[PDB]
Design a protein around this ligand. Structure first.
Ligand SMILES: Nc1ncnc2c1ncn2[C@@H]1O[C@H](COP(=O)(O)OP(=O)(O)OP(=O)(O)O)[C@@H](O)[C@H]1O
Ligand SMILES: Nc1ncnc2c1ncn2[C@@H]1O[C@H](COP(=O)(O)OP(=O)(O)O)[C@@H](O)[C@H]1O
Ligand SMILES: [Mg+2]
Lengths: 371, 253, 1339
């Protein structure tokens, strides 16, 4: 029960003229495909070219890359006289629309398409063209040495060519993006006072409906909805409070202090069917000083503890992250060494499990992290 | 669609949900073979729900959803001043149109009007695209679009070329007679206000103390020839209700 | 004169004395809210009444109760400026003390077992600022007053429009302050009927029966008895003469052997007088006379025991014989005459079927509660709760007063619940009205309409919340552990706060304040609206309520009203109007006793005013007070006529007590048409403030009142000397005698600099005082927007000529010189605010940084390290103001994604750009950035810099106060040391710290030194504590909405110039549009080569009948002339004697003016500063209806050596040739209205379309198209242009494929369309089909 000491006003008048607002209709928007089709219409194609262009633009993703191979498109046309070279010509024509480089098969194609539209006066263009055309994995893997051998070029020219490479656009289709992203309103709040975490539902999201009972059946049915809503929010609050009580240590000391709890614990604690617990916690979030977390985030698997008990997979992931974050660049830690290092604190996880956790956290293996 | 990724049901959806719920309850009671005294009131309530859906408020009390406001039904969607007939079929909003304040140009000839060029650039844009492509200044549509966006030094010459003999329609509300819409030839001026010939104001009932005007652009050849041959300001000297002249000097003249 | 008025004295041409000074213009709001808040021991106004209305609360078992004791309002957390900057409500916390008492059982009455007292919280109450405004969610709001029908009883009638016979129907309506209405009505057949809450019509006698009444009692109440006697012979009658008025005899009137009237002869007044003189009582009447007389009471024979006849029944011959033979010699009947004493109640009983008490009650229950079987006890409870329950029906004190006044009673006090007597008297008065006695009421009378202000409405809303709180409380109080619970556990703060904030933020009468200029604010606050809850509607108003009523004189402005659909429903208060203790408007009048006009002021309301004779302010008087003529023009009983001297009772106080403020700011009002006066008053409040304010050369003297009483200027709280003046702050050293003890006497005034108004204009205060000069209490220190030295100043004085100029001023156009543009006379500043909010998401916290991945370095030049633009940067459309990155997502990835992350970094693949950019077509300079970060989150460099900037000022203020106090203490310590015989020169050379580094002798000297050291260290500790507290306040974290991290607000400022298409106007309803900016060498010029500034059309003066402007022009020229003379005396160093002599000669000019100016009391410096202020023209005041005559204007023109006719000879600027006729040149006060062509201009070729009907959107903010309505279609049909119409209907609006094909063909140089079918028609077909009706195209 506090008052927000700062905020943003809403741009509108407090009172509206008494006439009723018109029914909501909507408003059209321009996505990438709409722009591409608009440019297609104003382009001197034939009829078959226009059909192939429609089929191609249909299969362009949000980033502007062509998701299907050309065989799918030529099959989708449904004609037999049309060959694959016509599809190639139409695709090459489409790839030069605005933004330049859209509908590209892969990154190499996009970069080459963008590079082909420069002027010859550019200081280092042929070097960049050759590097993209032939030796790309060398630039990605940060070799900088065998690339010097193959290119037969000194340091300065290669550095400038790489500077030109990192000046292009790898996602040309995201210039025309969505207007404004959505945001989620939290359902419950967990504050702390008296050394304890208080749990309370969002007041700004829970109004009390006016009871329409004066014309009095219908009154009893209306009260049934009230009782159902009461029971629903009571169940939500009880489940959230029990979950917060179980995971007290995490709320204080952050990660590496969760407990391996499953739906059975909640079902036995609140005396309810586990299906109801699964139903109520789906697509609902809680706001903590640490962030916003889905109500189902605290359930996970476990691993055996040598001294006794179990360790949350979230704690293992956090420990792996913190161990990797403080490794030596000269000799990055490997999976077996990581397992050996963690097998001193009672953590007993197989090498396969460590690999799965590392893949989940999206960290490159040791050989790609060496400096 | 509200904020937060959530939605609120409209009036038609509310009425549909109500009739569906009543129908489901009545069907379940019919399957159960409940006493008839209850099925009577259930059928009456379903009848009321259907009647409210089809035409809300015609018989009995009008159903309201919130703030004591009646819910629009299909009949209200069809009829009234806000219905389809009198709001979207007999009159509609159009493209290639603009509006602004009007001033007086005492130098114009009877078939001329003064148009700001920032409005003329926006109104005549596709013609500018076509003219730019025609003489090779832009091999593609995107190049012409970018060139027009930058407002380069040649798009003004192109704009002067594309509006040489191309009438535009000037309108001022309320349109009480057929002389409320008249076609003129544009002259590009610097400013943000339309300039109007002093001899046509009496026909428009227009004075220069804050009046605004709307301007529309004909597109097809037939529309341009109709504007020049039927709606031009030089063809409307005599009044269609009197036969007396309406292009008549007043005040200072 | 005050010091601020001695700098520039405005010459006054008024002639009538001022006896009452113009009051404070904002009393109506402040007094009402003060009444709402302040404690009231009597408990009738404010929160005390609301608290006592519902409390005490007793549970159903009656075993415990809650008892309110008192309440209290705490201190606001923030200030008005801080609340506006942050964007939070300026409110106070409500703390209320309650006591829960517990009762027992098995004991007589109620013993005190346990009483528990607790102070609880009830919510936040918003507070009213010093200018009668509320700050709700960062924006200032105004709650306007309501004009509503007062509670009580009203008698009305329809004017025969309900019946084709044209017979008028009369009704009486009782409307309470809270409860159910009551209606008595007459029908075409003369049968009284009752009605409750506009439900089904019911017989009137039902109410009488429900109150335990019998039919005989009703007939006694509503009729006059007549007694028939049977004195053993032919029913001899006791007759009264007056009863025979209007009667035609049907028998022989004979008594004492004299036939007074013969049979068949009409009874005349002479016969009545003869009967009165002769004292005739015994009259023999035949039995035939009893054909229709109705018996009063039921009659039974003694021996039989049966009933002879029933009451309310006509007597017959056989019944007469039956009663006569039954020993009946006395019978009772009713007097039912046609012209008077009508028999409406009897026929009402006849039509009424009920004849008992319970059946009527059951019928009432069935009528009010249909659809269920009745019940005796339920019906009784419903009837009791209807009109006699204090919890549902209340007639307020004003309601009771009006009720008693409408029934000619004596007392005023009474009960808010009804009684039998009140209803009986209501029916009696209605019947008397039906019988030609009395008259209906006039609803538009201002003695029947009441003013309801903000305090009363807020109190009503608070009570409405409190009753819900009571309903909730009654549940918890029923059962529970009576010990471990507390009063806090029973209350629930949410409903009260919800209701109060809903009323203050989303009500119909709560609006944003108008902030174009001070006049807009003053006018908006003094407004009376008939709309809103409990009021009229724009559709059910009528036509008589929208017209001037004779009772509006002196209370409501007749001129000021909004044209349009809201005409007559919105009003503005007059200058002197007040309200009663009940809420009725009243106006002041001087009292005239014995033909001598006194100075005693009485406030009269609408009802009292009609019963007197009131003179006019125009009447002339002698020095001692007598009238100068035998016949005086006066108002009486709604009329105006002539009266004798001794007949007069009262007199008006001022000639301007009829108009409002905006109308009273117009010079030469009486020479203007009323419509033009209204137009000028409306346009005068839409004028935007300009760069430099300019006083009006011709005013009315109401400028200073509007300027000071608006709250836009910093006025000194106490007198003193200006210690420190700066362009951003003023520090005044208060005089010794006005200082409070134990206080360093200084006032600190912080001026507001370049802040945003509700209309995106500029609010900026400038100091208008010098260093070290005296100021007295009430003087003005700073000039707000549109103010010059404390005088209201909305526009600029322009040199204007009236003549046609080559058609550039044709049809209300305006020709403006180029020198006007070159001097920035009509240049304005506009300020805009844009906000960016970084919040939390499920994929991570949105971040604010300058490291945006896909944006080049060029766009990031103007951002700092934190990602926020620098102060002073010039921005245009598309520039990045605040850079914000939003987490894009997280996936299992893919080899191509791994390659992209490896080559182009990880951050570029984790987040996407969501920065804040300047909207297209916007420009300005960044003048202010504000940052709010949620508590606990680490701050950034920008926020820390802003906090340091904020802390510096608080430290400076505290240092100023502390240093003054320290100097005061050091004076005393030095004096004590010197009185101790210390080495004076040694301490003079020693620094002030070395003064403390000493000691005194063993006498009381050392005691004094110790005392002053204690005081010094105590003061230092106290001010260190103050500094720490203010640092804590500044460095405090921010509690924001959940999920929100940071908020950044950026302010842009731009300057707008004048151009063709802008709208200008004067004060006399002469509006126009600028058409051309003529170069300087083309404007017409006079003999001296001085050009004119603006050229207007003469033809527009006579056709509009706003002659006053012309007069203003003439007088304006005169004023300017005076200035020129003074200016000439300053370019050449003339001595002060000639200057002051000429200024005095100018001020003394006039024909018996009321202003006496004596310059001999002025020092030469004051005279020189006055001449410096007057060198640009002497300002002149002409009151509205006591202005300056033409002769005075001609004399003033003669004084300045200008032609008297007001017309000079102008020359052509292009050819140098003199115009053939003299032209009128002068100075007029021009304004710049808020209709800028920058906002109107709009065009569109193609954009976004609606989702359902596929038609273009509407509006400039939506980038929409222009509507082509039905009438334009009719015009195109009349022309015969079918192709234009077809391409208007399909290819421009709805043909989804037609639009695309048309665009493609236009790009290809091929102009041709292929129309299809509009989508709206398919939508219509679907909507018709959804009704169950088959409609289709065919063939
Ligand atoms: N409710 C309305 N419906 C339709 N047209 C309206 C309405 N109110 C005003 N108008 C239009 O506004 C015009 C009035 O013009 P304007 O306001 O410029 O002043 P005016 O009548 O020419 O007089 P002046 O300029 O001398 O004060 C009318 O002729 C009419 O066309
Ligand atoms: N309701 C209306 N419908 C159509 N035109 C109007 C209407 N009201 C005013 N106008 C025209 O628009 C012009 C500008 O009006 P505006 O300035 O908005 O009114 P006002 O001068 O009363 O503020 C006026 O000259 C008038 O002729
Ligand atoms: Mg006009």
């Amino acid at each position: 029960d506090t008052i927000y000491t700062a905020g943003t006003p809403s741009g509108t008048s407090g009172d509206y003229i008494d006439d009723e607002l018109p029914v909501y209709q909507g408003e059209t928007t321009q996505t990438l495909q709409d722009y591409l089709m608009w440019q297609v219409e104003l382009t001197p194609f034939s009829d078959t070219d226009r059909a192939i262009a429609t089929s191609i633009v249909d299969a362009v993703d949000e980033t502007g890359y062509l998701t299907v191979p050309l065989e799918d498109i030529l099959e989708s046309i449904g004609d037999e006289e049309i060959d694959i070279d016509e599809v190639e010509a139409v695709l090459k024509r489409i790839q030069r629309f605005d933004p330049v480089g859209v509908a590209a098969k892969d990154l190499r194609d996009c970069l080459l398409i963008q590079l082909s539209q420069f002027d010859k006066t550019t200081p280092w263009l042929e070097e960049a063209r050759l590097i993209i055309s032939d030796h790309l994995d060398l630039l990605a893997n940060h070799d900088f040495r065998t690339l010097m051998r193959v290119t037969r070029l000194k340091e300065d020219v290669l550095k400038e060519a790489v500077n030109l490479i990192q000046s292009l656009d790898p996602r040309p289709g995201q210039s025309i993006q969505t207007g404004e992203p959505e945001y989620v309103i939290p359902d419950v709040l967990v504050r702390k006072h008296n050394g304890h975490w208080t749990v309370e539902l969002n007041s700004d999201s829970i109004p009390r409906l006016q009871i329409n009972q004066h014309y009095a059946s219908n009154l009893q049915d209306a009260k049934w909805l009230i009782k159902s809503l009461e029971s629903r929010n009571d169940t939500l609050l009880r489940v959230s409070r029990c979950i917060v009580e179980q995971q007290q240590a995490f709320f204080e000391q952050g990660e590496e202090y969760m407990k391996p709890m499953v739906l059975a614990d909640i079902a036995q604690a609140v005396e309810m069917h586990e299906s109801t617990i699964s139903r109520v916690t789906t697509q609902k979030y809680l706001h903590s000083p640490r962030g916003i977390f889905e109500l189902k985030y605290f359930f996970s698997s476990h691993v055996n503890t040598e001294g006794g008990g179990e360790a949350s997979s979230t704690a293992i992931r956090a420990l792996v992250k913190k161990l990797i974050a403080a490794e030596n660049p000269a000799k990055p830690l490997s999976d077996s060494k990581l397992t050996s290092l963690l097998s001193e604190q009672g953590i007993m996880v197989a090498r396969r499990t460590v690999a799965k956790y590392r893949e989940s956290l999206s960290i490159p293996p040791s050989n790609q992290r060496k400096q | 669609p509200l904020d937060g990724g959530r939605f609120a049901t409209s009036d038609l959806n509310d009425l549909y949900r109500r009739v569906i719920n009543r129908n489901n309850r009545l069907k379940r009671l019919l399957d159960l073979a409940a006493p008839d005294i209850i099925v009577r009131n259930e059928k009456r309530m379903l009848q009321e729900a259907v009647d409210a859906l089809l035409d809300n408020g015609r018989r009995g009390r009008a159903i309201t959803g919130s703030n004591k406001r009646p819910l629009k039904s299909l009949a209200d969607m069809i009829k009234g001043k806000q219905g389809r007939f009198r709001q979207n079929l007999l009159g509609k909003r159009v493209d290639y149109s603009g509006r602004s304040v009007i001033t007086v140009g005492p130098y114009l000839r009877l078939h001329q009007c003064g148009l700001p060029k920032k409005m003329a650039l926006e109104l005549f844009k596709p013609f500018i695209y076509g003219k730019l492509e025609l003489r090779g200044l832009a091999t593609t549509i995107k190049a012409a679009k970018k060139m027009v966006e930058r407002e380069e030094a040649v798009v003004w010459d192109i704009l002067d070329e594309v509006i040489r003999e191309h009438p535009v329609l000037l309108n001022r509300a309320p349109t009480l007679h057929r002389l409320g819409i008249q076609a003129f030839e544009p002259v590009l001026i610097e400013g943000k206000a339309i300039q109007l010939h002093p001899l046509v104001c009496a026909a428009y009932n227009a004075d220069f103390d804050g009046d605004q005007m709307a301007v529309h652009v004909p597109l097809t050849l037939e529309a341009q020839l109709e504007a020049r041959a039927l709606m031009m300001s030089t063809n409307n000297i005599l009044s269609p209700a009197n036969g007396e002249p309406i292009i008549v000097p007043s005040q200072d003249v | 004169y005050s010091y601020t008025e001695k700098k520039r004295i405005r010459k006054d041409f008024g002639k009538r004395p001022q006896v009452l000074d113009v009051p404070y213009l904002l009393s109506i709001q402040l007094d009402s809210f003060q009444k709402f808040i302040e404690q009231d021991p009597e408990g009738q106004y404010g929160l005390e009444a609301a608290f006592r209305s519902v409390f005490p609360i007793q549970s159903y078992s009656g075993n415990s109760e809650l008892q309110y004791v008192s309440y209290r309002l705490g201190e606001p957390v923030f200030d008005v400026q801080e609340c506006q900057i942050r964007g939070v409500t300026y409110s106070a916390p409500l703390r209320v003390k309650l006591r829960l008492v517990i009762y027992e059982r098995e004991a007589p009455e109620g013993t005190v077992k346990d009483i528990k007292e607790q102070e609880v919280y009830m919510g936040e109450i918003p507070l009213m600022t010093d200018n009668g405004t509320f700050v709700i969610n960062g924006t200032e709001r105004v709650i306007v007053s309501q004009l509503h029908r007062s509670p009580g009883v009203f008698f009305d009638s329809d004017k025969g429009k309900t019946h084709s016979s044209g017979k008028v129907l009369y009704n009486a309506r009782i409307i309470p302050y809270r409860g159910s209405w009551l209606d008595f009505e007459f029908d075409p057949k003369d049968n009284l009927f009752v009605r409750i809450d506009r439900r089904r019509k019911l017989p009137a006698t039902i109410i009488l029966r429900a109150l335990n009444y019998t039919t005989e009692q009703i007939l006694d109440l509503f009729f006059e008895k007549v007694i028939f006697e049977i004195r053993d012979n032919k029913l001899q009658m006791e007759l009264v003469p007056e009863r025979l008025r209007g009667e035609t005899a049907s028998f022989d009137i004979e008594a004492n052997g004299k036939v007074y009237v013969e049979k068949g002869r009409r009874i005349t007044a002479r016969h009545i007088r003869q009967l009165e003189k002769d004292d005739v009582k015994l009259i023999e009447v035949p039995v035939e006379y009893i054909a229709g007389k109705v018996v009063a009471k039921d009659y039974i024979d003694e021996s039989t025991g049966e009933l002879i006849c029933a009451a309310n029944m006509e007597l017959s011959l056989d019944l007469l014989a039956k009663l006569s033979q039954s020993g009946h010699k006395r019978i009772e009947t009713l007097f039912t005459n046609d012209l008077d004493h009508g028999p409406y109640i009897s026929e009402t009983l006849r039509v009424d079927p009920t004849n008992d008490r319970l059946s009527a009650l059951v019928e009432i229950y069935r009528m009010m509660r249909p659809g269920e079987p009745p019940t005796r006890e339920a019906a009784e409870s419903l009837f009791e709760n209807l009109f006699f329950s204090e919890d549902r029906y209340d007639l307020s004190a004003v309601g009771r007063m009006k009720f008693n006044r409408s029934l000619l009673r004596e007392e005023i006090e009474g009960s808010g619940i009804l009684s039998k007597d009140d209803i009986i008297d209501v029916m009696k008065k209605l019947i008397d009205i039906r019988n030609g006695k009395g008259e209906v009421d006039d609803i538009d009378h201002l003695g029947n309409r009441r003013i309801r202000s903000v305090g009363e409405m807020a109190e009503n809303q608070f009570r409405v919340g409190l009753v819900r709180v009571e309903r909730a409380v009654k549940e918890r109080l029923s059962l529970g552990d009576l010990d471990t619970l507390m009063p806090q556990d029973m209350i629930n703060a949410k409903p009260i706060s919800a209701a109060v904030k809903e009323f203050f933020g989303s009500s119909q009468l709560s609006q944003f304040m108008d902030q174009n200029n001070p006049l807009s604010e003053i006018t908006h606050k003094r407004r009376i609206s008939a709309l809103g809850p409990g009021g009229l509607t724009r559709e059910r108003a009528g036509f008589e309520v929208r017209d001037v009523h004779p009772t509006h004189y002196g209370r409501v402005c007749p001129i000021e009203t909004p044209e349009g659909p809201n005409i007559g429903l919105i009003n503005s208060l007059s200058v002197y109007a007040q309200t009663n203790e009940y809420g009725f408007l009243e106006t002041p009048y001087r009292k005239v006793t014995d033909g001598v006009v006194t100075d005693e002021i009485h406030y009269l309301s609408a009802i009292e005013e009609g019963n007197y004779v009131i003179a006019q302010a125009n009447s002339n008087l002698d020095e001692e007070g007598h009238f100068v003529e035998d016949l005086v023009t006066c108002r009486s009983k709604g009329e105006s006529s002539l009266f004798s001297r001794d007949q007069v009772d009262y007199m008006d106080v001022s000639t301007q007590q009829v108009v409002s403020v905006g109308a009273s700011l117009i010079p030469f009002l009486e020479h203007d048409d009323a419509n033009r006066a209204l137009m000028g008053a409306n346009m005068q409040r839409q004028a935007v403030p300009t760069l430099r304010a300019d006083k009006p050369l011709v005013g009315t003297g109401m400028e200073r009142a509007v300027a000071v009483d608006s709250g836009v200027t910093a006025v000194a709280k106490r007198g003193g000397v200006v210690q420190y003046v700066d362009a951003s702050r003023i520090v005044i050293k208060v005089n010794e005698d006005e200082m409070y003890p134990g206080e360093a006497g200084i006032d600190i005034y912080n001026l507001t600099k370049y802040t945003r108004s509700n209309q995106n204009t500029c609010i900026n205060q400038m100091p208008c005082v010098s260093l070290g000069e005296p100021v007295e209490r009430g003087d003005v220190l700073a000039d707000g927007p549109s103010t010059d030295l404390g005088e209201l100043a909305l526009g600029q004085n322009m040199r204007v000529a009236f003549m046609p100029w080559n058609g550039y001023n044709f049809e209300d156009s305006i020709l403006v010189s180029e020198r006007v543009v070159q001097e920035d006379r009509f240049t304005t500043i506009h300020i805009q605010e844009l906000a960016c909010v970084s919040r939390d998401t499920k994929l991570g916290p949105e971040e604010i940084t300058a490291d945006i991945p896909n944006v080049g370095e060029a766009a990031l030049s103007k951002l700092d390290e934190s990602g926020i633009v620098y102060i002073g940067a010039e921005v245009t459309g598309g520039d990045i103001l605040v850079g914000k990155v939003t987490p894009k997502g997280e996936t299992q990835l893919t080899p191509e994604e791994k390659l992209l992350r490896a080559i182009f970094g990880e951050k570029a693949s984790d987040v996407k750009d969501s920065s804040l950019r300047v909207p297209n077509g916007v420009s300005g300079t960044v003048i202010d950035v504000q940052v709010f970060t949620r508590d606990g989150v680490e701050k950034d460099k920008r926020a820390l810099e802003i906090e340091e900037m904020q802390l510096k000022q608080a430290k400076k203020d505290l240092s100023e106060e502390l240093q003054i106090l320290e100097a005061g203490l050091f004076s005393r310590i030095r004096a004590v040391l010197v009185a101790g015989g210390v080495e004076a020169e040694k301490l003079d050379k020693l620094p002030r710290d070395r003064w403390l580094e000493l000691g005194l002798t063993d006498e009381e000297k050392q005691n004094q030194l110790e005392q002053l050291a204690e005081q010094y260290d105590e003061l230092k500790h106290e001010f260190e504590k103050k500094l720490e507290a203010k640092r804590r306040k500044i460095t405090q974290g921010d509690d924001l909405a959940p999920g929100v991290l940071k908020i950044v607000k950026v302010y842009l400022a731009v300057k707008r110039r004048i151009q063709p298409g802008d709208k200008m106007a004067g004060r006399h309803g002469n509006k126009g549009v600028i058409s051309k900016i003529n170069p300087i060498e083309d404007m017409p010029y006079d003999e001296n080569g001085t050009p004119v500034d603006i050229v207007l059309n003469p033809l527009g003066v006579p056709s509009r009948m706003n002659i006053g402007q012309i007069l203003e022009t003439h007088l304006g020229m005169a004023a300017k002339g005076i200035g020129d003379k003074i200016n000439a005396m300053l370019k050449q160093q003339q001595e002060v004697a000639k200057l002051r002599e000429f200024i005095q000669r100018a001020y003394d000019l006039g024909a018996d003016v009321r202003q006496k100016v004596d310059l001999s009391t002025f020092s030469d410096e004051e005279v020189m500063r006055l001449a410096e202020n007057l060198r640009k023209g002497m300002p002149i005041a002409t009151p509205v209806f006591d202005g300056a005559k033409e002769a005075e204007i001609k004399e003033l023109l003669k004084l300045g050596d200008l032609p008297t006719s007001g017309q000079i000879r102008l020359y052509d600027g292009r050819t140098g040739e003199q115009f053939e006729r003299p032209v009128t040149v002068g100075y007029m006060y021009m304004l710049k209205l808020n209709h800028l062509v920058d906002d109107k201009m709009h065009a569109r070729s193609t954009g976004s379309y609606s989702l359902v009907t596929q038609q273009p959107l509407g509006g400039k903010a939506q980038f929409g198209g222009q509507r082509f309505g039905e009438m334009e279609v009719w015009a195109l049909e009349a022309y015969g242009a079918a192709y234009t119409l077809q391409e208007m209907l399909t290819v421009k609006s709805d043909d989804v494929n037609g639009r695309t094909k048309m665009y493609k063909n236009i790009v290809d140089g091929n102009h041709q369309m292929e129309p299809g079918m509009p989508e709206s028609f398919n939508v219509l077909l679907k909507e018709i089909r959804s009704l169950g009706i088959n409609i289709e195209l065919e063939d």
